[PDB]
Design a protein around this motif. Structure first.
Motif, PDB file in Angstrom:
ATOM      1  N   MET A  18       0.812  -1.203   0.000  1.00 13.94           N
ATOM      2  CA  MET A  18       0.000   0.000   0.000  1.00 13.94           C
ATOM      3  C   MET A  18       0.855   1.267   0.000  1.00 13.94           C
ATOM      4  N   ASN A  19       1.970   1.241   0.712  1.00 12.20           N
ATOM      5  CA  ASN A  19       2.844   2.388   0.706  1.00 12.20           C
ATOM      6  C   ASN A  19       3.495   2.574  -0.661  1.00 12.20           C
ATOM      7  N   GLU A  20       3.887   1.482  -1.309  1.00 13.36           N
ATOM      8  CA  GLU A  20       4.368   1.592  -2.686  1.00 13.36           C
ATOM      9  C   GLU A  20       3.313   2.263  -3.569  1.00 13.36           C
ATOM     10  N   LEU A  21       2.065   1.853  -3.430  1.00 13.81           N
ATOM     11  CA  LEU A  21       1.000   2.418  -4.267  1.00 13.81           C
ATOM     12  C   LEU A  21       0.796   3.897  -3.969  1.00 13.81           C
ATOM     13  N   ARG A  22       0.865   4.311  -2.701  1.00 19.66           N
ATOM     14  CA  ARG A  22       0.792   5.742  -2.389  1.00 19.66           C
ATOM     15  C   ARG A  22       1.890   6.487  -3.104  1.00 19.66           C
ATOM     16  N   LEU A  23       3.113   5.974  -3.000  1.00 16.80           N
ATOM     17  CA  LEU A  23       4.219   6.719  -3.563  1.00 16.80           C
ATOM     18  C   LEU A  23       4.165   6.776  -5.083  1.00 16.80           C
ATOM     19  N   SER A  24       3.563   5.779  -5.740  1.00 18.42           N
ATOM     20  CA  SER A  24       3.371   5.805  -7.189  1.00 18.42           C
ATOM     21  C   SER A  24       2.165   6.644  -7.595  1.00 18.42           C
ATOM     22  N   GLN A  25       1.449   7.175  -6.600  1.00 15.30           N
ATOM     23  CA  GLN A  25       0.173   7.873  -6.774  1.00 15.30           C
ATOM     24  C   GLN A  25      -0.845   7.021  -7.563  1.00 15.30           C
ATOM     25  N   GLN A  26      -0.986   5.760  -7.187  1.00 11.49           N
ATOM     26  CA  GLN A  26      -1.945   4.852  -7.809  1.00 11.49           C
ATOM     27  C   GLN A  26      -3.061   4.495  -6.828  1.00 11.49           C
ATOM     28  N   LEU A  27      -4.304   4.463  -7.322  1.00 13.32           N
ATOM     29  CA  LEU A  27      -5.530   4.145  -6.574  1.00 13.32           C
ATOM     30  C   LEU A  27      -5.866   5.173  -5.509  1.00 13.32           C
ATOM     31  N   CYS A  28      -5.202   6.309  -5.495  1.00 14.60           N
ATOM     32  CA  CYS A  28      -5.469   7.334  -4.491  1.00 14.60           C
ATOM     33  C   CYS A  28      -6.809   7.984  -4.772  1.00 14.60           C
ATOM     34  N   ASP A  29      -7.547   8.286  -3.707  1.00 17.24           N
ATOM     35  CA  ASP A  29      -8.845   8.931  -3.830  1.00 17.24           C
ATOM     36  C   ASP A  29      -8.963  10.165  -2.940  1.00 17.24           C
ATOM     37  N   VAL A  30      -7.901  10.558  -2.282  1.00 11.88           N
ATOM     38  CA  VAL A  30      -7.881  11.821  -1.541  1.00 11.88           C
ATOM     39  C   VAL A  30      -6.563  12.542  -1.762  1.00 11.88           C
ATOM     40  N   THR A  31      -6.652  13.860  -1.930  1.00 13.23           N
ATOM     41  CA  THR A  31      -5.495  14.746  -1.903  1.00 13.23           C
ATOM     42  C   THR A  31      -5.636  15.700  -0.731  1.00 13.23           C
ATOM     43  N   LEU A  32      -4.677  15.630   0.187  1.00  9.51           N
ATOM     44  CA  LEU A  32      -4.560  16.528   1.326  1.00  9.51           C
ATOM     45  C   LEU A  32      -3.700  17.740   0.981  1.00  9.51           C
ATOM     46  N   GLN A  33      -4.337  18.893   0.978  1.00 10.84           N
ATOM     47  CA  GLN A  33      -3.668  20.153   0.722  1.00 10.84           C
ATOM     48  C   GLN A  33      -3.395  20.860   2.041  1.00 10.84           C
ATOM     49  N   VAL A  34      -2.116  20.981   2.356  1.00 11.40           N
ATOM     50  CA  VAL A  34      -1.650  21.415   3.666  1.00 11.40           C
ATOM     51  C   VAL A  34      -1.008  22.785   3.533  1.00 11.40           C
ATOM     52  N   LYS A  35      -1.590  23.799   4.170  1.00 12.90           N
ATOM     53  CA  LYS A  35      -0.997  25.122   4.204  1.00 12.90           C
ATOM     54  C   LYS A  35      -0.878  25.568   5.661  1.00 12.90           C
ATOM     55  N   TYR A  36       0.361  25.763   6.141  1.00 14.90           N
ATOM     56  CA  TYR A  36       0.599  26.088   7.542  1.00 14.90           C
ATOM     57  C   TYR A  36       1.385  27.393   7.554  1.00 14.90           C
ATOM     58  N   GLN A  37       0.715  28.414   8.093  1.00  9.87           N
ATOM     59  CA  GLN A  37       1.262  29.742   8.297  1.00  9.87           C
ATOM     60  C   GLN A  37       2.156  30.239   7.156  1.00  9.87           C
ATOM     61  N   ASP A  38       3.461  30.399   7.416  1.00 15.42           N
ATOM     62  CA  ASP A  38       4.410  30.975   6.455  1.00 15.42           C
ATOM     63  C   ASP A  38       4.945  29.951   5.455  1.00 15.42           C
ATOM     64  N   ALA A  39       4.826  28.660   5.766  1.00 16.34           N
ATOM     65  CA  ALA A  39       5.505  27.635   5.004  1.00 16.34           C
ATOM     66  C   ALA A  39       4.828  27.442   3.648  1.00 16.34           C
ATOM     67  N   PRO A  40       5.580  27.072   2.638  1.00 12.98           N
ATOM     68  CA  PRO A  40       4.951  26.826   1.341  1.00 12.98           C
ATOM     69  C   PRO A  40       3.947  25.700   1.394  1.00 12.98           C
ATOM     70  N   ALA A  41       2.879  25.873   0.622  1.00 13.83           N
ATOM     71  CA  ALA A  41       1.829  24.871   0.608  1.00 13.83           C
ATOM     72  C   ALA A  41       2.399  23.549   0.112  1.00 13.83           C
ATOM     73  N   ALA A  42       1.820  22.461   0.599  1.00 15.42           N
ATOM     74  CA  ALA A  42       2.156  21.114   0.125  1.00 15.42           C
ATOM     75  C   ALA A  42       0.933  20.250  -0.060  1.00 15.42           C
ATOM     76  N   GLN A  43       1.069  19.166  -0.848  1.00 11.09           N
ATOM     77  CA  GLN A  43      -0.067  18.257  -1.003  1.00 11.09           C
ATOM     78  C   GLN A  43       0.396  16.817  -0.917  1.00 11.09           C
ATOM     79  N   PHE A  44      -0.498  15.963  -0.446  1.00  7.90           N
ATOM     80  CA  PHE A  44      -0.205  14.553  -0.226  1.00  7.90           C
ATOM     81  C   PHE A  44      -1.366  13.732  -0.761  1.00  7.90           C
ATOM     82  N   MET A  45      -1.082  12.849  -1.707  1.00 12.27           N
ATOM     83  CA  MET A  45      -2.085  11.915  -2.193  1.00 12.27           C
ATOM     84  C   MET A  45      -2.068  10.658  -1.340  1.00 12.27           C
TER      85      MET A  45
END
Length: 131
Positions: A18-45
């Protein structure tokens, strides 16, 4: 009359895939968009079902009573992107590593997603670092 078998390493092996599949961005159904104060925005599938298996908070977020038309974007504030990254890695691997200076922020994030295991470990570290 009855034959029964268990593979003990199975869940370990499957989570590795499952971790391999996350890292390949396969079968993902959620994208977490993370913006914390001053830091550049990031996203995680990721996979909603995996996040739900490691956090009562993600589970409630995703088990809404009308099944989802595809890939959902979720906006996260209040947690540094680097902390979310580590929590996701814990869910997919059962391990987490950080510098002593980040232990507090990770524990905060783990409280926010009710990852009780990581809350306990961080609490126990901080207390040993006393006296």
């Amino acid at each position: 009359r009855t034959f029964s078998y268990t593979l003990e390493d199975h869940t370990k092996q499957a989570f590795g895939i499952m971790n391999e599949l996350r890292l390949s961005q396969q079968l993902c159904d959620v994208t977490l968009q993370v913006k914390y104060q001053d830091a550049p925005a990031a996203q995680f599938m990721a996979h909603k079902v995996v996040l739900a298996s490691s956090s009562p908070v993600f589970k409630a977020m995703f088990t809404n009573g009308l099944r989802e038309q595809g890939m959902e974007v979720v906006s996260i504030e209040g947690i540094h992107p680097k902390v979310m990254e580590r929590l996701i890695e814990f869910a997919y691997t059962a391990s987490i590593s950080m510098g002593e200076k980040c232990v507090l922020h990770v524990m905060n994030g783990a409280v926010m997603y009710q990852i009780d295991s990581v809350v306990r470990a961080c609490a126990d570290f901080l207390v040993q670092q006393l006296d």
